[PDB]
Subunit: 479 residues, 3 copies
């Protein structure tokens, strides 16, 4: 008779893309994990103050709004919109200040305060009765006005600082506080990692009239003071400077960069745990990549891609007379048969184990390469707050597109590598079988060996374990 | 005798580049189409007003210059340079305003007007006798001056708006119109998709003196008014705001984004039609890509690349004793011979048809991939006007370089895939021939089969159409 | 007997990465050259003035500090820090001015002067006794003040120009020079390749008070004048304009772009020569790429990459019965044996020479492709000064990361191509040997040929040079 070695015939599950062709495979999966329909927040605390506080109220430490100063900060937080009024004075924010305040109120790090340094350098802060509820502000009102100074300080962390002015909308109060003429225009300048500036004038002159018109009015209608704020950026090891004159104001806190909380936009479900969450749902455990449109997430999360890709999970179907496949059912991926089905077909676990190990190792190497590329693209020392703030109002990140293209190319390369490794394993197994069999028989060049004798089911079964011997099968002659 | 199957010998036309090697091929073509030496403008209207109008005159709706308000806008348009004087007042434009006005005067979309809203909100516009020829402007001159306000409106389309001031160069007129003091400095601010601002002062104070010196004088030498203009951007669904004081001016029209006309720079030829045009010539019909240095074009145009690449159009020349080639001439790419030339060599159309179909399908898949990459690079909702305006004075687009590199890699991949598919077709044909022939004969391992009998001229022809039978050829024995 | 042809067995040196697998090779090297521990400055002059001059002193042509006006400019230069005082007036620089002055004081090109044009256009420059030591400045003080003008000039080279004001910190001097009121705010504007502006006011008004506080005091404590400077950029063929008023100042020199000197940061070693230097060490001669984190270098330097990669330098080890390897030692890479070691094994130099040439040619093509990609990424007409100035305070260049990724991919492709070419050479050699031998013998399909006769060592070496003939070996019969 004769024997053959090959793969187990299984239904074709799909098609994957290699470098030079498309291959039909018996099994495939997806590299990235898909978003769920809810947020699994078991074991996590949720902060919600949308009915009592606004974004600005948190920065100024209003009574009952102290998220940036909590000892333990919840990963999920919600609050009122940007235009929510406070109980103190009226406020105005620039566009840059709005963009950065959308983030800085919910940073999960530890914030640094430098109000005591200002107090000891320039004396006690100015006092007004309209800001009794708020606490976190320093008002520079020297005895001799305007009395310009430049305040320099070495920062303790990378972050943002809000500065500006606090002025009345009446001419008498403005003159009493600033000590300038109404027709004059003056500036407050900030020099840190970058440069920022803001201009002020009298209540009936530009641009202060526009500030008055555009300001957000407070809950108390008798309050005349408006606090106008801009933002500046500071680096950890460098020094920053602020040009101060009478009437200038500064919030004496550095809002350090890092992770910041996620505002839930979908249903929050308890009695369900996870480790990677986003504003629109959680992700399955142990994902190599996640299908997300941003880098903002909480918990332990992998890199994000914009779309999913298919990777091989089985083996190529290289079959339609022997054509490499084995009709008989076997418990494995490779087998030895003698055209007898039911008991004369035996499978070898060694080749299947090798193929599974090859798939695992190639996938691990691919994931490592992708992580290295992600680190190169975004940087080793990166923070989500800084990236999101620098993006600004833009919702499209080009680095995500570059990373997605790289991941697609990597997936194609992985499919190619896995297929080639499987081919090498099969060729090595065939060569080993030919070596073990003997030189007497001849090879048909397709994995089937014709023996000089008859090979019963026991002869086939002995070959798979490798204990086959030629002595007991020499009898009789056939071709 | 014996028979052989193989490819038709043809002269080598060139060399293409694959992933792992360079392959010699009998035919190749180019992916992209080349620019022509003229513009084919049959069936298209051409606008030319360079002898009577300038760029600014079109925006202000000067008598005889109304391109942005035409019902049907020609695809080709020419007009005077930016420094062309108008018949109204003198004008001054910022650098950003100049850059955006180079584009906005020839947008092919429909522009939105909001002058009636301004009139009903604030009353009739201010009137001067020096602007009788121009129509498209609103001059905010309230009864009580300065009377600052903030005008907010929800936009109807994404586009640009030109704002600023309209002031005299005499102190008396400036004081009468603005109602301010000459020593004061005031601002006009625009808040839309971004932020813009511009400053004004008295005629003898900075920066108004520089505006007077740098202004473009009008045709009438008795005109004292100067209109100073800056630009701002608005998004479709969002609201925009302008800070207005007495003396401020605004052009009450949103110049919507989209396609804009092309100014011809080469000879215009009628009696010749095309569908893709550029400023330096037209392009051939039905091109997958065009060799262009920008994304600005009119008509139906494909993506543009910076240089051309070669793609395979024939088959690889895998020949220098039989070496895979067939000496005898045949009407196809594949054939069967018996070392007899003239009638005993027969060609099979099936393999040639399969190879041509493979080339076509691979090229189509490549073009689809390139289109997807282009959409990812530039965005699904993109307009030529916005891209060109954001580019500014820069003439080098990095996205074009990235796309060209991607297209080069794609072309290499396509060559590899086509060559592999041709190899697979050839191997399948050889296996089918071996199966059809029979087990009696032996294979030399190079596509040539030695028969046990003689194969005459009719025997070769019988094999080609697949009706070959063994019964009538068993007679006689040879090796 | 029998003969075999194959590769010489050598110890495995390493593993390289190809497109679809990792290959074990007998030799590999690195694409890029590594930085040395010293600067080899034999035959080069070194400039050092850190004990007498500062950066600003060089621009103003202070007595003894004239690097930008030297006939021959040394490639290595050192000077005092930016905050070094001068012997003239006090100075203040904006952040942009500081960033550009860090570079422009050491440009190696020829600088263009236009002071004579200013003198002939507007008369003799204003004179003060506090600037007797400095020479390179023009002070615009007309007879009728303020007397605003706009100065337009066609540039001669691409570069930077420093402009601004020169004012006293006393009210009387400010009024006498400017001719303005103290409460007014005025601007100096620069229009070139981009737009720049700077604002001034009275000594007791913003922002001049901040300039006074932040200024760097001069060596002489009786000097009251402060020169406040900003920077602007000019292109070669275009015209630039400056808005000048009484009291404005401008440095009448265009600091042309190009290469600029390197400040040594490591030990300088003479009696040692090189052609590529950086601030932290030199590089070996004749390197295709250098491991550097920037594009700033002096001498003839190749493109820089951020990390090194391995390229093949030998051949793949395709061996563990004959398995393609030859046990006997030979003087080459390929050989012919008859299982007799010591004298019956002969090597062929043709295949080894072909393999070495293939390696060289593939590496050269790779280097050419990398150079083309570098030129596309950075531009054909580029200068180091412009790139470094546009980078600013950023120390991470993304184009370097893109180039490094491209070089990694290119190295993988080169390994693949070299291995494929070696395989082709081996297959061609085997086919030629089979053709030369004869049809009588049979092939075992593994590079070993069994002859019908015995083959002594003489029969073996006769094959190597190809003068083998069958006539003298027909005698005797064996299998
Ligand atoms: C303070 O800072 C916050 C954080 O920066 C700001 O949050 C952003 O607010 C935006 C305005 O509300 C918001 O934009 C909305 O996003 C919604 C997203 O939900 C969608 O769900 C769909 C399915 O139901 C998806 O189809 C859709 O888009 C997909 O996203 C996938 C990833 O999940 C991608 O793989 C897919 O390709 C697909 O398409 C992407 O869409 C992206 C835009 O969402 C786009 O950038 C990307 O290129 C792909 O094209 C999406 O998942 C939409 O339903 C809304 O219509 C609207 O677009 C941002 O998502 C918020 N960002 C984050 C990180 O939370 C907050 O606004 C700010 N506050 C203020 C006052 O400024
Ligand atoms: C209002 O907006 C308009 C649109 O934004 C502005 O139009 C631009 O005006 C510029 C100044 O007039 C103009 O620059 C000129 O371009 C000419 C182009 O013609 C050349 O023809 C040559 C053959 O005869 C080509 O060799 C040459 O360059 C090639 O272009 C090929 C594509 O066609 C490329 O594949 C090749 O690589 C090759 O090299 C490219 O050159 C590009 C620059 O042209 C460069 O960006 C690219 O990276 C490659 O290096 C070119 O085709 C030149 O002859 C002139 O010397 C000058 O460079 C722009 O082309 C105009 N742009 C468009 C889209 O029309 C208009 O200026 C503005 N008005 C104001 C007042 O600002
Ligand atoms: C006027 O202009 C000058 C030129 O623009 C400015 O010079 C810069 O000054 C900076 C501050 O002094 C200086 O930053 C320092 O750089 C040092 C570099 O020396 C290190 O040596 C180490 C080994 O001993 C390396 O490990 C290290 O980094 C490596 O660099 C390799 C290339 O040589 C890379 O292949 C490696 O990946 C590795 O990591 C890189 O680091 C880079 C930063 O150095 C980073 O950008 C890159 O992405 C890689 O991550 C480095 O070689 C450090 O020791 C110091 O700690 C500090 O970082 C800049 O290097 C100077 N730039 C140049 C071109 O000279 C000058 O500041 C300015 N003056 C003013 C007043 O502004
Ligand atoms: C009916 C009415 O509003 N009449 C006003 C009258 O209120 C106003 O007097 C000012 O009123 C405000 C009301 O909130 C404060 O009470 C002002 O007192 C203080 C304050 O505590 O806010 C005193 C404090 O010492 C001042 N601080 C500094 C640093 O100077 C501030 C400061 O002057 C102002 O807040 C300016 O921003 O004010 C009280 O003076 C008078 C103005 O004299 O005008 C009537 O029409
Ligand atoms: C010889 C000479 O020029 N003498 C001037 C004299 O012209 C000037 O009077 C002004 O002259 C201009 C000439 O174009 C206009 O006629 C001015 O009239 C108007 C106008 O432009 O129609 C009247 C109009 O009601 C005004 N509109 C508004 C909204 O206020 C404008 C406006 O005041 C000015 O255009 C300012 O921009 O002017 C006419 O007053 C006198 C100035 O009184 O000075 C002589 O030297
Ligand atoms: C003790 C003391 O400082 N008393 C000052 C007295 O110095 C000052 O007079 C000015 O002093 C400076 C000292 O460096 C110069 O000597 C001024 O002379 C000149 C100069 O040469 O610098 C004269 C020159 O013609 C002027 N140039 C122009 C273009 O106008 C300049 C110019 O006025 C100033 O430099 C302004 O920047 O000054 C000399 O006038 C007096 C002021 O009158 O004040 C005492 O308190
Ligand atoms: C996914 O990961 C989460 C971790 O966030 C798992 O939740 C933990 O499960 C272990 C084992 O049951 C418990 O001891 C922990 O108390 C759980 N954490 C919390 C916060 O409850 C979760 O089991 C994992 N598997 C899923 C969700 O299928
Ligand atoms: C290229 O495309 C243009 C379309 O712009 C073709 O011109 C049209 O040709 C058809 C068929 O002859 C006519 O019915 C149309 O009237 C033509 N259009 C116009 C505007 O005249 C042109 O024939 C195509 N082929 C070329 C140019 O070779
Ligand atoms: C590396 O290159 C340098 C050139 O910068 C070589 O130095 C020159 O060597 C030649 C030959 O000995 C001399 O004639 C020149 O005078 C040298 N130049 C200088 C400036 O001295 C150097 O020899 C090369 N090889 C090394 C450094 O190993
Ligand atoms: C292999 O052996 C079987 C029976 O022993 C025979 O039918 C078959 O033809 C043989 N294969 C070949 C290629 O001759
Ligand atoms: C492939 O296998 C999966 C099992 O994970 C199955 O859900 C899917 O339907 C299969 N696809 C086909 C085409 O049979
Ligand atoms: C405040 O903002 C919210 C959403 O940003 C908006 O719905 C609301 O109308 C705003 N309130 C006012 C008074 O404009
Ligand atoms: C305001 O200006 C006048 C002169 O214009 C001046 O006398 C007065 O001192 C100025 N006001 C202050 C507070 O200095
Ligand atoms: C094939 O047959 C021809 C003649 O029938 C003969 O000359 C040739 O040697 C044969 N091929 C081989 C490999 O023996
Ligand atoms: C290749 O074929 C084209 C036909 O389109 C011909 O123009 C060209 O000259 C040929 N090239 C060579 C090298 O024969
Ligand atoms: C107007 O501009 C054109 C081209 O931009 C130029 O040739 C002409 O000299 C300019 N006219 C004036 C008066 O500057
Ligand atoms: C100009 O300023 C003076 C005082 O400096 C003031 O009295 C006058 O009202 C101002 N002009 C206007 C139009 O308000
Ligand atoms: C080749 O010849 C040797 C001796 O001549 C013999 O031992 C060996 O078995 C032969 N090879 C084959 C495949 O028969
Ligand atoms: C590879 O060869 C180099 C010789 O250039 C040698 O220095 C190195 O140690 C070798 N590596 C191994 C693993 O033998
Ligand atoms: C000047 O700068 C150097 C380094 O930039 C610094 O060490 C020194 O303290 C500075 N001098 C002063 C007076 O600030
Ligand atoms: C300063 O302003 C006053 C009026 O405010 C004016 O009379 C005087 O001429 C101005 N100074 C100058 C130098 O013009």
């Amino acid at each position: 008779n004769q024997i053959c070695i090959g793969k187990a015939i299984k239904p074709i599950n799909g098609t994957v893309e290699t470098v030079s062709r498309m291959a039909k495979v018996t099994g495939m999966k997806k590299v990235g994990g898909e978003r769920m329909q809810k947020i699994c927040a078991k074991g996590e605390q949720i902060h919600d103050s949308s009915s009592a506080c606004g974004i600005v109220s948190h920065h100024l430490k209003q009574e009952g709004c102290d998220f940036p100063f909590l000892l333990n900060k919840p990963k999920f937080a919600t609050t009122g919109p940007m235009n929510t009024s406070t109980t103190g004075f009226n406020f105005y924010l620039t566009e840059k200040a709005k963009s950065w305040m959308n983030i800085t109120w919910r940073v999960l790090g530890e914030n640094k305060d430098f109000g005591d340094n200002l107090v000891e350098k320039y004396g006690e802060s100015g006092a007004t009765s309209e800001g009794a509820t708020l606490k976190n502000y320093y008002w520079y009102v020297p005895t001799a006005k305007p009395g310009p100074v430049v305040y320099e300080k070495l920062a303790e962390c990378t972050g943002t600082i809000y500065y500006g002015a606090l002025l009345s909308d009446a001419e008498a109060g403005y003159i009493a506080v600033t000590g300038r003429n109404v027709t004059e225009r003056w500036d407050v300048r900030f020099t840190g990692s970058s440069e920022s500036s803001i201009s002020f004038s009298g209540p009936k002159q530009s641009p202060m009239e526009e500030y008055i018109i555009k300001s957000v009015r407070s809950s108390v209608d008798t309050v005349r003071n408006i606090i106008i704020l801009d933002s500046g950026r500071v680096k950890k090891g460098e020094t920053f400077s602020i040009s101060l004159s009478s009437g200038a104001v500064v919030i004496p806190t550095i809002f350090c960069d890092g992770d910041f909380a996620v505002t839930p936009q979908v249903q929050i479900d308890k009695d369900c745990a996870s480790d990677c969450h986003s504003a629109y749902g959680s992700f399955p455990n142990g994902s190599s990549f996640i299908i997300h449109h941003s880098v903002h997430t909480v918990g332990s999360c992998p890199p994000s891609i914009l779309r999913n890709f298919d990777v091989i999970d089985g083996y190529e179907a290289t079959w339609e007379f022997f054509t490499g496949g084995i009709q008989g059912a076997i418990d494995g991926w490779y087998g030895v048969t003698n055209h007898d089905t039911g008991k004369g077909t035996a499978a070898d676990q060694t080749s299947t184990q090798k193929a599974v190990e090859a798939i695992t190792n190639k996938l691990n190497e691919a994931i490592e390469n992708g992580n290295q590329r992600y680190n190169q693209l975004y940087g080793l020392a990166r923070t989500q707050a800084e990236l999101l703030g620098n993006l600004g109002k833009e919702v499209n990140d080009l680095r995500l597109e570059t990373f997605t293209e790289f991941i697609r190319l990597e997936t194609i390369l992985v499919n190619t590598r896995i297929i080639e490794e499987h081919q090498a394993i099969g060729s090595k197994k065939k060569e080993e079988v030919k070596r073990l069999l003997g030189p007497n028989a001849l090879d048909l060049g397709n994995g089937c060996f014709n023996l000089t004798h008859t090979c019963d089911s026991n002869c086939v079964n002995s070959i798979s374990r490798g204990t086959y011997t030629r002595e007991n099968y020499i009898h009789n002659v056939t071709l």
